[PDB]
Each structure stands twice: as structure tokens, then as C-alpha cells.
Design a protein around this ligand. Structure first.
Ligand SMILES: [Mg+2]
Ligand SMILES: [Mg+2]
Ligand SMILES: [Mg+2]
Ligand SMILES: [Zn+2]
Lengths: 440, 213, 267, 122, 98, 255
DNA sequence: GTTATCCGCTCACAATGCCACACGCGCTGCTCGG
RNA sequence: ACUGCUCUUUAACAAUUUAUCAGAUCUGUGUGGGUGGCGUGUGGC
């Protein structure tokens, strides 16, 4: 069961069993919407656990690893501060004076230990040298956007050479784009970290209780553990250097969660390999873009090995009885329901399971003109996918005309080919009109 | 304890899965409830054969106050102070008239308790209900005189065939004697069960003798 | 489970609301007296405030309390505050208009942690605790999922205490009536905030509200998906008393629309 | 049960010399120092020193039961006489440690003195 | 099980207190609990007040009659019948187990 | 006055029961109109069984006649529909029976709070056994205005805004629960001092206007005339506040 | 000297598609436990 | 050994200012509900 107020808690995200309370009190659709009181979960569709998100009230502000280490660093250009010093002040190994008080300290100047403590001796107030993430947050929130924007604007028509003018026009472009949009620079430093919906990082089980811990849960556990420990330390009188190092560690963990790339690695236990961060779930050949969004796996198709079959006409193509009977199954169910040969859908499933002597006539009927798509594994150019009319054959091979197999750049060395069935009427007619072999 | 509230009823639990229902008329019109509260009432109806819920508890029917006094008043429950009758107006105002067999008993000084403690406790348990303890006499005229307390009537004209009683208060006390919605009167007309009449104590009610002199 | 201080607060609010309902059905027992502009304050306010203070001190004899009447009763501790309004919309309870509520919220280190409002006439109980959300009689609260200023309903309040902004205010409303569908006006800030968090109205805004008239509702609308702000997008609304609240889209649209109509005194 | 003021850290009373620096670092399993810039440590200030010292004194004087209960939270009962009841902690106590708890006994709520061992979750 | 279920009883009334203590020891006997002495401790005065519209320039004095019941054999019937049979208001029932 | 009112009350009872029943299917623009039609249809059944001679007048069905065209039934099965669309519980059913070119029977029933106001011409308007004695205000000092923004008459938008601006400069505060019929019932029962709205319709205020007039109040148009029946421009309340409101609102009108 | 200029220094950031198969997936001495 | 010596006949009350004439419903259980994520390697084309 999801531990209460945890990375899968039902109270925060949603009920596990469909339309059923966690504690087990409510169990019927008669209560769609109410929350229980033994465990306090809103009894609705389990699907919602795919949607609801969580948040973590970070015990202290922390930088966002993207806007810090994505050349050119957004914060750097937004503050006219070299990235090295910004990194040295984020990770608690420097200081930064803000507001530039009576002392001869500039609002952007940094400090190390001895300079900081010496100025502290020389100035007990009017001199605020803060260090760490929240220091940068205050530095941002104190900065006036359009003021410095128009300052650099009036300044750019004054100076030379064009290298300074180039960097400065880049910066004023950044500031203008910023103030134009509704964004506010202090948002660039996270204060409340949103945690992905649970279902999208599912703890997948094994045959027993060896649940495969998806690395996202590992990173989140690390971060929330740092946060809890840091809050507990903040409550116990806060030994200064201790809390300093702890905020540094928490910053590191959050950076690793947003991106395991920079700042070393965050390797899992005894498995010498980095953990899939959030960015690692988006970039690359396995990121959602090139893996699920741009090209997505199709449920309504099949593949086989291609023989020659040199008898079929130029638009026809062989098709094994097994593959057609597996593909066109819904069409077969529809035809059986039409002729009434099986009143219920489950009866039709049974009939297809037994392959009565009528199902073959039905199948032969349902594809008499229904086109089909054949595809080669490397689809270099447009002809890599063509449309044919299937003809039922035996065996398991996929016959195809020799001419188009010279077009597919397809030999018969065992090269495999994938099949696809356009199911909507638009797609059928489209394949017949556009990608049928007698067109290309 | 309760489980669920509706616009027409609420569902109660009595432990050991003992489930009851309370209808809308059984409840006070303004008694706010919430899953978890420990409500009390009187088990007025049962249906050991109904297709659904079977135990019926109420708080509005007049026997509720009888039972409340019975659990409060140690005199009652041993019938040393027999509860004669009681009329109600749910949650708003309920008059009650009792008798007593013992002579040294002060029903006004006992059933009320000490400086208004017993009847006050019953009221605050009932959820803000005005209560009027009064002595039951065995004469309908004097009884209804007692009923509209606080009041004072100097022209009691009874007619037993018509079930009518002209019981008219002193001129000026009317706004208090009748009371809002005629509650003090509405309950009286129910306590004795007679179609009363409270108009005028010193004029235009004695047509015969009045117009005579 | 249930947040502890939330349980104490909801019990206290329940008792106060029962007393309120008791005083309601008697248009005789109310003995009010005028204190501000076009509004009275009744003895019922004092009675309910007394009940709330006593019930709180029963299980918390040291917490600081805040109220429109008693100002700030500084308990022996000063990090746990209880902002209380024993009545929101006393004007309505004067005329016995059955739309009002009791409001109780708890501030920890300045941050509101638990909050409840209670409408005894419909027996509605808006609870809300930080990091766990807001509930209406046992149902979650997500606020209106509207995505623009079209077809929306806008709850508001007229500044009967600061009528100078009225003209400006009027213009604002006028401008808003160009786009939104209809307005709502109940004379009860807490219930307006609740309805916003309830998804009953798709946005609320008011000029010059009292601190203890939103400190309970603001956590409701927060944990019900909505956001709150001043009329310039900042967080100073707790001091100016100038509030806008609702789901992020409608709040952004309202702020964009009002950026011009507003006056510099408010910003 | 044993807790720590702050885990992962250890406190020493060393001095500042590169030899002693290594001698601290040349031990079986430690990371670097915790302070100023690496290779130039910084001392935990004397104020924090006496603060943690007072904390240590207080925890050494009185072994005290933590994991307390907060006034106004519902809780079950594991008591013999009152098994499988549940009530709200009406008033908490520490030295007496007996949890004044309101619960439904003969109808209306009543306060009881159910001791810590007779208190369930929260 | 464990023994000391000790019931204190503040009160401002007289006859209902005798009735309550009597029915309490009655329930204890209907259970079998070794009901201790009710032991009516010495009555305690209380100067009360009238926090309403006062006089012009009264529940002022009252006598709290106290009761100290004890049940030290709480089997099922004791707590069952006790939580079943409610007791009238006006009396305080702060009990202890320890 | 007894049988007509009893029939109308039973009709409003059935309507409110069905409305509250259907109020418990949470969903997040059409099914509201569906349950509207259903309540209207069961109302129609109530009209057909009892007194099949009278004629019905609804915002939805227009006017459906029988034989007795002298008895019109003006039944709005829902006022302030948008509230029920948004689950905001402020809505009621408004039954009216006009006889001889004049309203005679009026009922407004909120099923949520169970508010059942009845009204017969002459003998007055009761509520649950109580008599609505209007408002006690003699002017626009500290008063409340059951104000209604014309979300269907956007042509008079700016005029109405200037009017309510002058008012709020003079008056104290507004109220708007988005239910014309209930607004009229409330200003009738002294719960809000004065009322005024722009561009209304007969099926909306048909009962509320009588509820108000029977409560020692008046109902008129923005020019004191009596064409507010169809011009949709209504101001109502006890005569003192209505006079005090018209005297301020006349000099910025357009109709 | 300084101000702008430029050139080597270091780091981020990409590596065809499918298919199939196989294998594995913390731990560990501290902590909860009788 | 050395305070103690009748006090005089069981409770001492709340409800309370327009307005009244007391003024449709106790039916179910038809119906469904009741291996995989990643990494790596290997090959193939
Ligand atoms: Mg090949
Ligand atoms: Mg207030
Ligand atoms: Mg309508
Ligand atoms: Zn549950």
C-alpha cells in the first residue's frame, strides 16, 4: 500500500483501485466524488493518478540547474556576473554583498571568508553579504528589470567597440524578452519543487516483491530526504556551518534530479551507471521526443519475412492467412455480427478462435478491396512504404511483386518487412489513391 | 453517530452495525449535522420487515421531550411527577404541563431545578428550544389560563360545545401574550386542543353585558 | 488522519455557527449598534467571539488570537496566531439575509496553516489545510477550470468603508463587464473566497479588504488550485487589503485587463 | 531509541596545522572538512559551541520521551479496559504523561487519563 | 484487565446525583466489577457570578456536591453498558485510568 | 385562494424535489437544459391533471393554450440557470397564475433552503406561515440594493454602469445572487431593502412582483410607468426607497 | 596603462533504423524484531 | 493531664413584546467491473 504522505500516497495523488477507497470503506459508483475519513482519499477513477502532480516545499531556496549551466547561462547574462563566481556562491563557498551599502562594496561584488568577516568587523549593518541560493534569489528580486534595460539601452548608443556592443545587445535582448513576457527573475530559483505524477514513474513489480525502483523515485527520495533532514536541522538551533553544508548538499541533490549530467554523477547503489533524470526522460534517442512522440509504436500491424511470389499482379501482394486473421479481427467481428452468425462479440471471438469454415469466406470478403501498407526496415526515401491489395496465401511469408522489391531496395536475403492496415475510411481511400504501387 | 446527511433524511449508526435512519420531519429544521457527531433522539418507529432501513429515530415528536425529562428529572421516571401533556413547535418553543401526586413538591421549583438549570439543560441539549413549564390543572379554563404564561387574562369565557375559549390578555401585553407567530397561543390551542380566542379583556367581548351597560 | 489544530478550529467554528443559527431565528434577540459605514455590529458578534476564544483556550491556553473586536490578544506565545471572524457579512445577519459564515484560520511563523469557514444556513463547511488541500463537506475543491475571461462569473465587493475608490472601482467593473459574463455580490468576503475555491464563481476581486476577512479564505483558494495576488501581481495584498483570486488563467486575464483601469494609489 | 543532533557529521577540537589537517583527513572513512574553502578550514564559532554544549547537557541530564501528542488530534486506544475506542486529545501532559483525552463515554464526551502506553497512532 | 477506572463527579444538583451513582454501581454489579466506595467527599463551596446585564448601582453562591466512584474490574459489560446508558447533564464526569 | 395555491405549491414541491435530486450528478452546458425541460414537463403534467383548462406560458415552450385562455400559467421551472450550471445553490422555481389580465397567484420556491413564498392578491403573501412585512427603510441610507447586471442586454451596459455608480455614491451596498425571482422574493421579505434590474422577462418576475407588492411595496419601471411588464425594466421595494431611488436615477437614463 | 583584440583552453553536445534474444536489476552494517 | 457542649425542621423559578385565532414517498441486484520499467550485451538485416 502507498505509504501515507509518500511518493505514491493515495491521499495526495489518487486512489489505487478503480472507484474504491483505500481503507476499503467506499466501494461503489454511488460515491463518485466523496473522500473517505478512515484514510482520506477521493474515490474516483484510478486514471487520475496519471494526472495529479505533487509539490515539495523546499526547506530553503535552490537554483535551477538548467538556467545555471545552459550556455549561455540565463542567470549569468541576467546579472552581468561571470558564471564561475555564480557557481562559487551558489554552492556555499563564497559570499555576495547586496544593495551596496555605505561601504565601498558594489551590489554585484562577491566575497570570500576573510574579506567577509573583515568587512563584518568594519560594518555590522548596511552591508548584507548573503551566500547561497537564496542570496541569488534576493539579488534577482532586488534587480529592477526595465530600469537596467533602459539604462543599457541609452548606454549602447555611447560606447565602442562592437564586441562590448555585441554582448550588451545580447543582454538587452534578454532583458526585453524577459520583461515582455510575464516571467519574473526570482522564479528562476526554485522554492517549491513539483514532483511528477506517480503513475508516470511506476514502481513496476516482479514475480514476488522485487519491485523495480524506477530511478526517478530514487532521485525524489534522495531530495525529499535531504529536505526533511535540513528542516529538522533548521529547527534544532542551526549550527551555522552544518546547515550551510546541508543546504549545499540539498542544492546538489535537486540539481541531480533536474539533470544528472552536470556536477559529477548520482550513481545508483552498486550499479555503476548514472540515473535517468527528468531531462534524461526528454532528450536523446530514448527521450519522449524521438521515442514516443515523433515515432510511436503501432498496435494494429505486424511483420514477417518476404519471399518472392512472382505471380501476383503489380498492385497485389501476398499475405499469410495467420497474419490477416490476426490483423483484420475487428472487421471480421463486424462482418460476423452483420450476418448474425454470432450474436455476441464473445461468440465471434470464439468462432475466430476455432476458425470455422465460414470465417475464411468472411475474411476473403472483408478485404476484397481493402488496401494494406508494406514497409521496409530502413525507409530511406518515400517509396519505403507502399500500398497494395492483399491476397491470401499459406505459410508465413509475405509475397511481394519483384519490381517493387527492387524499388524497396529489398533483396531476399531474409530481409523482413512490416505490414500495416489503414482502418479508417479516409486512410483506406488515401492508400488506394496515393501510395498504391500503381501510383509510384 | 451518523454516516451521511441528505435533504430528506440522515443515516445513523448505533455500533455493532446497527443502522438507523431519521427522516426530515423528525429533525429540527436548523439542526446542523456532520459525519461524526453523536446525536441522540427517541426510537419512535421500527420496521423489522422493511425492504431497507428499519430503525426510525426522531427529535421533533413530543415524546422526545418526555424522554429527555425522564432521563433528566429524577422525580420523573418514578412518576412522583406525572408528565400530563406537552405541546411543541419544533426547535422553537415547546410548552409542557405536568401534575404531581405529592403535596410538598414544587413542579416549578423542582422540574426547573435551581435558578433555571434543569429545563435550561434540556433546552441546550435540544439545540436552542424555548420551553414553558407550567402546572396542569384539571379545569380547561384554568388550565389554558396557566398555558399562556407569561400572560394574564381577566375574561375567561368558555364554550365546551364549540371547543372555544375566549381567553384575552390585558391590553398591552398582547405583543408579548400572543407572541411571534402566536406561539404562546399556538401551543396553548394545541396543549388543551381547543380553538381559543385572545382578542380583548376589557371591551367589545361582552356584547350582551357590555351593550347592556 | 486530520490535522490537529484543524480539528480544534473546526469544532470551535461549529459551536460558533450553532450559536449564530440560534440567534438567527430570533429577530428580537439581536441588539446591534452601528460602528462603521452602513453596517452594525451585534451582541451576537461578542457572544460568538467569546465562545470561540474560550473553546480555543480550552485546548490552547497560550496561542495568540486576532479579531476585529479584541484587536490582537497576545498569548504567552506569539508564533501561533488564530485569525478569527465570528461573522463575515454582519450587514446580512442584520437583515437576516441567510448568507454569512464564521471564519477561523491559524498562522504559523506568519504562514497560514489551517483554515475553515462555515455557512450554518446551508450547513456548508469549507475546510482547508496546507499541503493537503481544501474540502467541502467531504468533497475535494479544485476551483473553476475556466481558461479565460469568457463566460466567467466574477465575485466582488463594493468598498462601503473606502467609497473614494468607487469611481475607479466602477470603471474597473465596467471594463470587466466588457468581457466577463456576470458578477456576484454577497457582502461576505470569506464565502466569496470559498465559492472561488469551490469552483462556484470563476474569480473574485475586492478593493481594500480587512486582513482577518481573507486570511482563512486565501488558504482555501490556494490549496484549491487557485492563486491570490494584489492588483499589481505582488504579494503585498495582506497590507493593502486589495485582493484578486482565482484560477491562474482568469487571474492573469483580470490583471492584464485591469493594469490600465486601475489607479496609482492602489498599485 | 537513539537519535542524533545531526547525522553524518562528527565534531572535533583540533588545531590548525597542515600536518593535523592531514591527520584528520588521513583516517579510514571521512569526506573533507565542513567549513571555509577546501584546504582552508573554518571553525564552528564559540557561540554555536556553547549552544551545542547546552543542548548536550540538556539531553544528558534528562532522558525524556519524545514523539509526543498535540492537543486536538484524534487517536485510537490500545488500553485493556478501553480497547478499540478513539477520542481526541483534550489536553496533553509530559511529566504526568497521561494524555487527558476526551472520548464518547455514556453519550456525551468525557475526559479520561489514558496513559501514553494506551495511546495509538498520533 | 487493568484496574483503576476512577470517576469524579462535580455537581450542582442533589437527587439526580444519588440516582446517577446508584445506577452506576448498579451497572457495575450487572457486570461484576469490584465497585469501590462512591465515598461522597466533603461538599465544596463555590462563589458563583452573574455575567449578564447586572444590577444597577443572583447565581453567586453554590455548593458543589462531589462523588468519587471507582471501577477496578472492567470487563466487557462495564464499559459496554456504561457507554450505552447516558447520564444527564449538569454533572461533570472527568474520569481517570492511571 | 386555497385550491389554486395548494395546486401551485404541490407543483413547486415536485419541481424542487426533481431539481435537488438531479443536483447530485456532478459534472465539469446542456444537461442543465435537459433537467430544466424535465422539471418543466412534470410541471406541465401537474397543469394537465389539475385544471386542464388553463393555459401555460413558459420561457421555453412559449405559450401552450387549452380552452380557458383567461387563466394563464406563467411557470419558470428555473431562475438564475447559470447558478445551477455552476452548482452554486441559489435558484428557485417561479409559478404564477394570471386571471383576467392580472396576476392573482404567485409562488417562488427555493428547494435548497426550502423557501416557499406564496402570494394571493389582496390577502397578501405568506412564507411558511409568516407574513412578509417588506423593508423598514425610508430612504437610501445604509440600504442594500438587489442589483442586477444585464448579462443579456449588453446594449445598456454603460448606462446601467453609470446608474449603479450614482447609486453606490448615494446608497450603501449591492447584492446579486444571480436569480431575479429570488431577488424579488428577498426584497419582498425585507431581506434586502430595494431591488432594480434591466431587461427582465415576464416568466422571471411574474411571481416576484406580486410577492413584493403584497409586502407593502411597489413595482414599477424606470419612469414610474406600468409598461415594465414587457420593457423588462423593473424597480421595486417599499415606496419610500423606490421614490428615493427614482429621484436619483431618472436624470441619467435612455428609456 | 588601459582598452579593445585575438588565440589557444576547456567544456557541452551530436553518434541510422528496426527486429529479436539474453542477462541483471544494492546494500549493509545500523535498525526493528522477537 | 486540659480542643469537642444542638447550628432548630431538604431544592426557592426558567421560558416574556404584532398578531395568532392555531392554520404529496416505506419495491430489486437486468448488465460489465469484482507480467512490466530500465540498463547492458549479443546477433541479424
Ligand atoms: Mg538484405
Ligand atoms: Mg468580521
Ligand atoms: Mg427560466
Ligand atoms: Zn478510506
Amino acid at each position: 500500500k502507498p505509504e501515507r504522505d509518500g511518493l505514491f500516497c493515495a491521499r495526495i495523488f489518487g486512489p489505487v483501485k478503480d472507484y474504491e477507497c483505500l481503507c476499503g470503506k467506499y466501494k461503489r459508483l454511488k460515491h463518485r466524488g466523496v473522500i473517505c475519513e478512515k484514510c482520506g482519499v477521493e474515490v474516483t477513477q484510478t486514471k487520475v493518478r496519471r494526472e495529479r502532480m505533487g509539490h515539495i516545499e523546499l526547506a530553503s531556496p535552490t537554483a535551477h540547474i538548467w538556467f545555471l549551466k545552459s550556455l549561455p547561462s540565463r542567470i549569468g547574462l541576467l546579472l552581468d556576473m561571470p558564471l564561475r563566481d555564480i557557481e562559487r556562491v551558489l554552492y556555499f563557498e563564497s559570499y555576495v554583498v547586496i544593495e551596496g551599502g555605505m561601504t565601498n562594496l558594489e551590489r554585484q561584488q562577491i566575497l570570500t571568508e576573510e574579506q567577509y568577516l573583515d568587512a563584518l568587523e568594519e560594518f555590522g549593518d548596511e552591508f548584507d553579504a548573503k551566500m547561497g541560493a537564496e542570496a541569488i534569489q534576493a539579488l534577482l528580486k532586488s534587480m529592477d528589470l526595465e530600469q537596467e534595460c533602459e539604462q543599457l539601452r541609452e548606454e549602447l548608443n555611447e560606447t565602442n567597440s562592437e564586441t562590448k556592443r555585441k554582448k550588451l545587445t545580447k543582454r538587452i535582448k534578454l532583458l526585453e524578452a524577459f520583461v515582455q513576457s510575464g516571467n519574473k527573475p526570482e522564479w528562476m530559483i526554485l522554492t517549491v519543487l513539483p514532483v511528477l505524477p506517480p503513475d508516470l514513474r511506476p514502481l513496476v513489480p516482479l514475480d514476488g516483491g522485487r519491485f523495480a525502483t524506477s530511478d526517478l523515485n530514487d532521485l525524489y527520495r534522495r531530495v525529499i530526504n535531504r529536505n526533511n533532514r535540513l528542516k529538522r536541522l533548521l529547527d534544532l538551533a542551526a549550527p551555522d556551518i552544518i546547515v550551510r553544508n546541508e543546504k549545499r548538499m540539498l542544492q546538489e541533490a535537486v540539481d541531480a534530479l533536474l539533470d544528472n549530467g552536470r556536477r559529477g554523477r548520482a550513481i545508483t547503489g552498486s550499479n555503476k551507471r548514472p540515473l535517468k533524470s527528468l531531462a534524461d526522460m526528454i532528450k536523446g534517442k530514448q527521450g519522449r521526443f524521438r521515442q514516443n512522440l515523433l515515432g510511436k509504436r503501432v498496435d494494429y500491424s505486424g511483420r514477417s519475412v518476404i519471399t518472392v511470389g512472382p505471380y501476383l499482379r503489380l498492385h497485389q501482394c501476398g499475405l499469410p492467412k495467420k497474419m490477416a486473421l490476426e490483423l483484420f479481427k475487428p472487421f471480421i467481428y463486424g462482418k460476423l455480427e452483420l450476418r448474425g452468425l454470432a450474436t455476441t462479440i464473445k461468440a465471434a471471438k470464439k468462432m475466430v478462435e476455432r476458425e470455422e469454415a465460414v470465417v475464411w469466406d468472411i475474411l476473403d470478403e472483408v478485404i476484397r478491396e481493402h488496401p494494406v501498407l508494406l514497409n521496409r526496415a530502413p525507409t530511406l526515401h518515400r517509396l519505403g512504404i507502399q500500398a497494395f491489395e492483399p491476397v491470401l496465401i499459406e505459410g508465413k511469408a509475405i509475397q511481394l511483386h519483384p519490381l517493387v522489391c527492387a524499388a524497396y531496395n529489398a533483396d531476399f536475403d531474409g530481409d523482413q518487412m512490416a505490414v500495416h492496415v489503414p482502418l479508417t475510411l479516409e486512410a483506406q481511400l488515401e492508400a488506394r489513391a496515393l501510395m498504391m504501387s500503381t501510383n509510384n | 453517530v451518523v454516516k451521511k446527511v441528505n435533504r430528506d433524511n440522515i443515516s445513523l449508526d448505533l455500533g455493532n452495525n446497527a443502522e438507523a435512519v431519521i427522516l426530515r420531519e423528525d429533525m429540527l429544521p436548523r439542526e446542523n449535522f456532520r459525519p461524526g457527531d453523536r446525536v441522540r433522539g427517541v426510537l419512535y418507529s421500527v420496521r423489522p420487515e422493511a425492504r431497507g432501513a428499519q430503525l426510525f429515530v426522531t427529535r421533533s415528536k413530543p415524546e422526545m421531550l418526555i424522554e429527555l425529562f425522564r432521563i433528566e428529572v429524577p422525580e420523573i421516571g418514578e412518576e412522583v411527577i406525572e408528565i400530563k401533556a406537552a405541546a411543541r413547535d419544533p426547535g422553537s418553543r415547546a410548552k409542557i404541563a405536568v401534575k404531581t401526586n405529592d403535596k410538598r413538591i414544587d413542579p416549578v421549583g423542582a422540574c426547573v431545578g435551581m435558578r433555571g438549570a434543569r429545563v435550561q439543560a434540556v433546552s441546550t441539549e435540544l439545540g436552542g428550544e424555548r420551553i414553558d413549564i407550567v402546572l396542569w390543572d384539571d379545569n380547561p379554563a384554568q388550565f389554558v389560563i396557566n398555558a399562556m404564561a407569561p400572560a394574564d387574562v381577566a375574561s375567561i369565557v368558555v364554550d365546551e360545545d364549540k371547543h372555544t375559549m375566549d381567553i384575552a390578555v390585558e391590553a398591552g401585553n398582547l405583543a408579548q401574550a400572543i407572541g411571534r407567530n402566536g406561539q404562546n397561543v399556538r401551543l396553548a390551542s394545541q396543549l388543551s386542543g381547543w380553538e381559543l380566542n385572545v382578542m380583548t379583556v376589557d371591551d367589545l367581548q361582552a356584547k350582551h353585558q357590555a351593550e347592556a351597560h | 488522519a486530520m490535522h490537529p489544530m484543524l480539528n480544534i478550529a473546526v469544532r470551535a467554528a461549529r459551536k460558533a455557527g450553532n450559536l449564530i443559527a440560534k440567534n438567527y431565528e430570533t429577530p428580537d434577540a439581536v441588539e446591534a449598534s452601528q460602528k462603521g459605514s452602513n453596517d452594525f455590529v451585534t451582541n451576537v458578534d461578542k457572544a460568538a467571539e467569546a465562545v470561540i476564544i474560550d473553546t480555543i483556550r480550552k485546548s490552547y491556553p497560550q496561542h495568540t488570537i486576532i479579531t476585529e473586536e479584541s484587536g490582537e490578544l497576545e498569548g504567552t506565545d506569539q508564533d501561533v496566531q488564530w485569525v478569527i471572524d465570528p461573522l463575515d457579512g454582519t450587514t446580512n445577519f442584520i437583515k437576516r439575509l441567510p448568507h454569512f459564515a464564521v471564519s477561523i484560520a491559524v498562522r504559523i511563523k506568519g504562514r497560514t496553516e489551517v483554515a475553515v469557514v462555515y455557512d450554518p444556513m446551508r450547513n456548508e463547511l469549507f475546510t482547508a489545510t496546507r499541503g493537503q488541500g481544501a474540502q467541502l463537506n467531504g468533497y475535494r475543491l479544485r476551483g473553476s477550470t475556466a481558461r479565460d475571461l469568457d463566460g466567467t462569473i466574477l465575485a466582488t465587493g463594493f468598498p462601503f468603508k473606502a467609497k473614494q475608490y468607487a469611481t475607479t472601482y466602477i470603471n474597473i467593473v465596467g471594463k470587466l463587464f466588457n468581457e466577463c459574463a456576470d458578477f456576484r455580490r454577497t457582502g461576505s468576503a470569506a464565502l466569496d473566497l470559498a465559492y472561488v475555491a469551490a469552483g462556484r464563481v470563476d474569480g473574485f476581486f475586492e478593493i481594500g479588504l480587512r486582513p482577518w476577512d481573507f486570511a482563512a479564505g486565501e488558504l482555501l483558494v490556494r490549496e484549491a488550485g487557485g492563486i491570490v495576488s494584489d492588483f499589481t501581481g505582488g504579494h503585498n495584498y495582506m497590507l493593502t487589503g486589495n485582493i484578486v483570486a482565482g484560477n491562474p488563467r482568469v487571474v492573469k486575464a483580470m490583471l492584464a485587463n485591469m493594469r490600465d483601469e486601475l489607479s496609482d494609489a492602489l498599485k | 531509541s537513539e537519535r542524533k543532533f545531526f547525522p553524518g557529521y562528527v565534531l572535533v577540537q583540533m588545531v590548525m596545522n597542515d600536518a593535523s589537517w592531514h591527520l584528520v583527513r588521513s583516517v579510514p572513512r571521512v569526506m573533507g572538512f565542513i567549513g571555509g574553502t577546501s584546504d582552508r578550514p573554518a571553525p564552528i564559532s564559540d557561540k554555536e559551541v556553547d549552544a551545542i554544549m547546552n543542548r548536550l547537557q540538556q539531553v544528558g541530564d534528562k532522558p525524556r520521551p519524545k514523539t509526543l501528542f498535540e492537543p486536538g488530534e484524534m487517536v485510537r486506544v490500545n488500553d485493556g479496559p478501553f480497547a478499540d475506542f478513539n477520542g481526541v486529545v483534550e489536553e496533553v501532559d509530559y511529566e504526568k504523561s497521561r494524555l487527558k483525552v476526551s472520548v464518547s463515554i455514556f453519550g456525551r464526551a468525557t475526559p479520561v487519563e489514558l496513559d501514553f502506553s494506551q495511546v495509538e497512532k498520533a | 484487565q487493568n484496574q483503576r477506572i476512577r470517576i469524579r463527579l462535580k455537581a450542582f444538583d442533589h437527587r439526580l446525583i444519588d440516582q446517577a451513582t446508584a445506577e452506576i454501581v448498579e451497572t457495575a454489579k450487572r457486570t461484576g466489577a469490584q465497585v469501590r466506595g462512591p465515598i461522597p467527599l466533603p461538599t465544596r463551596k463555590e462563589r458563583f457570578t452573574v455575567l449578564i446585564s447586572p444590577h444597577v448601582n443572583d447565581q453567586y453562591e453554590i455548593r458543589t456536591h462531589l462523588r468519587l466512584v471507582d471501577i477496578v474490574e472492567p470487563t466487557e459489560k462495564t464499559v459496554d453498558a456504561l457507554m450505552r446508558l447516558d447520564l444527564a447533564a449538569g454533572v461533570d464526569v472527568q474520569i481517570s485510568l492511571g
